[PDB]
Amino acid sequence: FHPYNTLGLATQSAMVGLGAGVVAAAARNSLALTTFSKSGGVVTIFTGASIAYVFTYCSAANLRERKDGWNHMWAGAATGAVLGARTKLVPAFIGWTVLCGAACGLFGWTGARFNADRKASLEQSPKGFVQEDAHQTFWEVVHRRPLSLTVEQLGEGRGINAVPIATATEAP
Amino acid sequence: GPELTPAVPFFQPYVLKWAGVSLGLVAFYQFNSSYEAKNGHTWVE
């Protein structure tokens, strides 16, 4: 993990959001100087959503030194906060926050992509039963796993022990 | 002396049904145990 440049990326996002809101305003006008008067604040919608999402995403990613879905969850929460401030009601603000955060957290969990990561997908991955003593990869299956792997992943206790009980309690 | 309400028969249909079923089941159990003791396996097996 090497940091996102939060300031720069947020500035570019501000630019993109401003342009997108401009395009939406022009469309809105054509479909209905008055374009910004009768805009409905769509330029602000785009600009605020852009800045909130990008700034919160980079901020969270830098602070946690990780890249995963949780950053998208935070960023969606911020974006929902922005979009739900427009209601001017506390319940709706909270609802937008939590639900947009949940939706974007789901999105980031699945890969933060709309299309697929082809190389990681099952169709492009080693699958089926593994060979002699190879390490298990994500899509592969065995008939028996190494007990040390069980003890390390699951953790000791609750019936998970390094040695089978009957063997350990055998007398001599 | 207290008053006296109308007569009612002792053995009702439900008495007959439940007593007959229960007693038949116990008799069947005993018969199977004895039939085990003699035949060496229970009549149901």
């Binding site: 299956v141 008939h143 699951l154 | -």
Partner: protein, 481 residues
């Protein structure tokens, strides 16, 4: 045979006009057939026994003896046999409990009821994920139609709930089943504990499976559909739903989840315990402030299922045996309470508000005795199967996690509170002014309730009588190194 039997069905329909005698006869034959199967079932073996395959390519319309198996698999072990026996016990009573109160399109109603029963019975025979899922969803159209046509005032919303919530859970179950299919290229239950997926993949599949289990059991916080669907269902729908369809969830855990995702289940167990303790405590408390009879009886089932879940994920033999026994006892008792509230009181007075009811003992002493017996059975009196199930489930849960199980021991108190608070008002006081005197419980109603009471008492005094079918199962799923 099938041709001749179809002829018999047609002629009986043409002459008599009401199929319901034929269906009752049929269901009784099915019960007898399953009992014959139990007679011929070998209990000294952990192998599926009455196997058959359908829709195999070499014989799409018959059974397959081919060396390639691409159809749907069916067969039974002890665990499936227990629930199958419960099902065939319950179906004829479900037909009988509506013997007189359906006076319109009655043939269609009885057809839907018997079809749902048969679908569940077949579901218990399924031996692979795809057929299990097929028969697991096949009920939803039938339940939707039945509730919509033969339900009470609010039946439209009930039908939409029962379809939508169960579909919502089932589709995530479908995601998990699709992942298993494409990763293993196999779907069977016979050898699916032989495949050891990577821990991360197990953790992912477990999510879809357990979301399905949350909606279907139900568990907190997605239980809100059940009280509705129960209250507006007709009596057969309510009895089936409470007595079989919920146990389909517990059977789903044991059959689909535990053998395949053992390590992920070990990882996730405390989350399951959180959710089960939540459902027990919170639904039991919420039951206190209900004003509808059928709604209260519905809320009772959720708490008992919470105790069942706590038992079934305890990773102990006692916990699993307790979960099974509790499932069976609940399938005996809850249909009886639903019979009372939605078939006796509702068919006499056509209302379910609690305020109207009071002091039923004076005119209907027999109904009052039945209410007392069934309520003390529901709250877990010993010498009833419910007590054995709750006790063993709590033992397993306390072993798996002493704190959580110890807190869960409050379910005894909470169950007593809501149930006895109901029966106190129903049985005693001065006879209500709002309602008039009606007949006492009849011979048919008494027959059904006697069947259920004797079943629960029999397994409550000697719960060991189930062990011959379940002694393999109590070891087949626990994961101790």
């Amino acid at each position: 045979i099938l041709l001749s039997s179809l002829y018999l069905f047609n002629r009986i329909l043409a002459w008599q006009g009401n199929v319901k005698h034929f269906y009752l006869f049929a269901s009784n034959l099915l019960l007898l057939f399953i009992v014959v199967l139990y007679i011929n079932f070998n209990t000294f073996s952990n192998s599926f026994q009455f196997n058959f395959e359908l829709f195999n390519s070499l014989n799409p319309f018959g059974l397959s003896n081919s060396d390639i198996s691409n159809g749907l698999l069916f067969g039974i072990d002890g665990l499936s046999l227990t629930f199958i026996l419960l099902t065939v016990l319950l179906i004829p009573l479900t037909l009988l409990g509506n013997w007189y109160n359906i006076n319109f399109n009655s043939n269609l109603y009885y057809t839907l009821v018997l079809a749902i029963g048969l679908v569940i019975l077949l579901n218990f025979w399924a031996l692979d994920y795809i057929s299990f899922y097929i028969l697991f969803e096949a009920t939803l159209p039938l339940l939707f139609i039945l509730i919509h046509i033969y339900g009470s005032s609010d039946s439209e919303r009930a039908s939409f709930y029962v379809l939508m919530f169960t579909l919502s859970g089932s589709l995530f179950m479908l995601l998990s089943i699709v992942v298993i299919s494409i990763v293993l290229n196999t779907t069977n239950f016979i050898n699916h504990n032989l495949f050891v997926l990577s821990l991360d993949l197990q953790t992912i599949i477990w999510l879809g499976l357990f979301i399905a289990i949350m909606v279907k059991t139900p568990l907190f916080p997605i239980h809100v559909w059940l009280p509705v669907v129960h209250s507006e269902s007709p009596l057969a729908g309510s009895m089936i739903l409470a007595g079989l369809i919920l146990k389909l969830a517990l059977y789903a855990i044991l059959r689909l989840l535990l053998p395949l995702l053992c390590e992920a289940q070990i990882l996730y167990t405390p989350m399951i315990y959180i959710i089960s303790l939540l459902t027990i405590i919170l639904t039991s408390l919420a039951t206190l402030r209900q004003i509808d009879l059928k709604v209260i009886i519905a809320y009772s089932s959720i708490s008992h299922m919470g105790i069942a879940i706590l038992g079934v994920c305890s990773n102990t033999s006692l916990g699993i045996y307790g979960s099974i026994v509790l499932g069976v006892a609940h399938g005996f008792v809850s249909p009886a309470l639903f019979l009372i509230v939605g078939g006796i009181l509702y068919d006499r007075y056509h209302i379910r508000i609690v305020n109207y009811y009071k002091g039923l003992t004076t005119y209907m002493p027999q109904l009052a005795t039945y209410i007392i017996i069934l309520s003390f059975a529901n709250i877990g009196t010993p010498l009833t199967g419910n007590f054995t199930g709750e006790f063993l489930s709590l033992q397993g849960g306390f072993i798996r996690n002493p704190i959580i199980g110890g807190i869960s021991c409050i379910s005894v108190l909470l169950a007593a509170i809501y149930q006895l608070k109901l029966t106190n008002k129903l049985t005693g006081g001065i006879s209500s002014i709002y309602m008039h005197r009606t007949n006492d419980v009849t011979i048919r109603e008494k027959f059904i309730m006697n069947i259920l009471i004797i079943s629960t008492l029999i397994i409550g005094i000697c719960p060991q009588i189930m062990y011959n079918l379940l002694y393999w199962t109590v070891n087949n799923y626990i994961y101790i190194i």
